Design an enzyme around this catalytic site. Structure first.
Site, PDB file in Angstrom:
ATOM      1  N   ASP A 237      39.556  43.008  35.854  1.00  0.00           N
ATOM      2  CA  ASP A 237      40.645  42.632  34.959  1.00  0.00           C
ATOM      3  C   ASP A 237      40.223  42.193  33.558  1.00  0.00           C
ATOM      4  OD1 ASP A 237      43.288  40.816  36.847  1.00  0.00           O
ATOM      5  OD2 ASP A 237      42.332  42.630  37.235  1.00  0.00           O
TER       6      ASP A 237
ATOM      7  N   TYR B 194      39.048  48.374  40.747  1.00  0.00           N
ATOM      8  CA  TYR B 194      39.806  47.951  41.931  1.00  0.00           C
ATOM      9  C   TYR B 194      39.480  48.842  43.126  1.00  0.00           C
ATOM     10  CZ  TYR B 194      43.099  44.693  39.568  1.00  0.00           C
ATOM     11  OH  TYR B 194      43.753  43.646  38.952  1.00  0.00           O
TER      12      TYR B 194
ATOM     13  N   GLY C 281      48.686  54.190  39.274  1.00  0.00           N
ATOM     14  CA  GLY C 281      48.195  55.528  39.617  1.00  0.00           C
ATOM     15  C   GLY C 281      47.533  56.126  38.376  1.00  0.00           C
TER      16      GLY C 281
ATOM     17  N   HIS D  36      39.390  50.727  35.026  1.00  0.00           N
ATOM     18  CA  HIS D  36      39.859  49.506  35.699  1.00  0.00           C
ATOM     19  C   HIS D  36      40.410  49.918  37.065  1.00  0.00           C
ATOM     20  CE1 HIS D  36      43.416  46.393  36.089  1.00  0.00           C
ATOM     21  NE2 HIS D  36      42.336  45.686  36.326  1.00  0.00           N
ATOM     22  N   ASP D  37      40.869  51.162  37.125  1.00  0.00           N
ATOM     23  CA  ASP D  37      41.431  51.689  38.379  1.00  0.00           C
ATOM     24  C   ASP D  37      40.289  51.836  39.381  1.00  0.00           C
ATOM     25  OD1 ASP D  37      43.977  51.780  36.978  1.00  0.00           O
ATOM     26  OD2 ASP D  37      44.206  53.782  37.358  1.00  0.00           O
TER      27      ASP D  37
ATOM     28  N   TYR E  51      43.087  34.432  41.036  1.00  0.00           N
ATOM     29  CA  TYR E  51      41.700  33.987  40.869  1.00  0.00           C
ATOM     30  C   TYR E  51      41.376  32.979  39.783  1.00  0.00           C
ATOM     31  CZ  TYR E  51      42.503  37.614  37.241  1.00  0.00           C
ATOM     32  OH  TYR E  51      43.010  38.377  36.214  1.00  0.00           O
TER      33      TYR E  51
ATOM     34  N   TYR F 164      46.156  57.038  33.067  1.00  0.00           N
ATOM     35  CA  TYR F 164      45.806  55.963  34.012  1.00  0.00           C
ATOM     36  C   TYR F 164      46.432  54.595  33.771  1.00  0.00           C
ATOM     37  CZ  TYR F 164      43.040  59.369  36.154  1.00  0.00           C
ATOM     38  OH  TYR F 164      42.654  60.531  36.788  1.00  0.00           O
TER      39      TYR F 164
ATOM     40  N   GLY G 249      48.864  51.931  33.979  1.00  0.00           N
ATOM     41  CA  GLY G 249      50.074  51.828  34.817  1.00  0.00           C
ATOM     42  C   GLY G 249      49.546  52.174  36.214  1.00  0.00           C
TER      43      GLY G 249
HETATM   44 CA   LIG Z   1      43.025  33.989  45.639  1.00  0.00          CA
HETATM   45 CA   LIG Z   2      46.039  53.051  37.156  1.00  0.00          CA
END
Ligand SMILES: [Ca+2]
Ligand SMILES: [Ca+2]
Ligand SMILES: [Ca+2]
Lengths: 124, 124
Positions: A99, A52, A32, A48-49, A73, A28, A30
């Site tokens: 993140d 998102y 995809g 983390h994937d 952000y 995971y 990187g």
């Molecule tokens: Ca923004």
């Molecule tokens: Ca990923």
């Protein structure tokens, strides 16, 4: 955005280049993934994937091109600490953490270099 | 966002509190407006109102709650200069400038204090 995620990986791990080290690592880490993460440091990336994944669902949020990697952000790094400003709106606040949790998580997980540049669609 | 706009007004005009001085000033400075700007420093504000007006139209952009004041975009102030990072995506890059042009514009326009706290829906 992408450049801040990286910049947070330095914050937490002042021993790197988070471009070299964790981009293209195991399944995971990187862009995809498929298969089961091959490690704990892969798990950080897998999770983390989803962070998102989930974000895209908040119907309050509408991220550009549809890759939250594209969300700026404001955060600030100080004494190896990763803080997340609150002047930050809710969509970018969701990303901040997606993140920030990886950056944390990463600093605490064994780095097998024998998983860096893994045969993705093979051992996945 | 709102807090950066202000923080850019300091950058360009190190002689202030851009909360006190330009919020609630003449017809367009502050939230909303009607009538013709009463001054050049009102014009700066009017024009920035369009800058955001316009932004809402970019069908590539979808700002939160629908007030681009809610967009965080990373810039950096140095030597009274206002730079706008390019790691910045296109929607926040549009705001950066909408916001940077006022800050510029403001620093160069006469401040009549006799227009601060103007009878909006009266002399407008
Ligand atoms: Ca923004
Ligand atoms: Ca990923
Ligand atoms: Ca206005």
């Amino acid at each position: 955005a992408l450049w801040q995620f990286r910049s947070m990986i330095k914050c937490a791990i002042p021993g790197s280049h988070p471009l070299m080290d964790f981009n293209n690592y195991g399944c995971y880490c990187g862009l995809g993934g498929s298969g089961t993460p091959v490690d704990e440091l892969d798990r950080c990336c897998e999770t983390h994937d989803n962070c998102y994944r989930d974000a895209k669902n908040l119907d309050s949020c509408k991220f550009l091109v549809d890759n939250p990697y594209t969300e700026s952000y404001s955060y600030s790094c100080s004494n190896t600490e990763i803080t997340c400003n609150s002047k930050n709106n809710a969509c970018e606040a969701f990303i901040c953490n997606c993140d920030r949790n990886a950056a944390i998580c990463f600093s605490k997980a064994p780095y097998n270099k024998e998983h860096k540049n893994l045969d993705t669609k093979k051992y996945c």
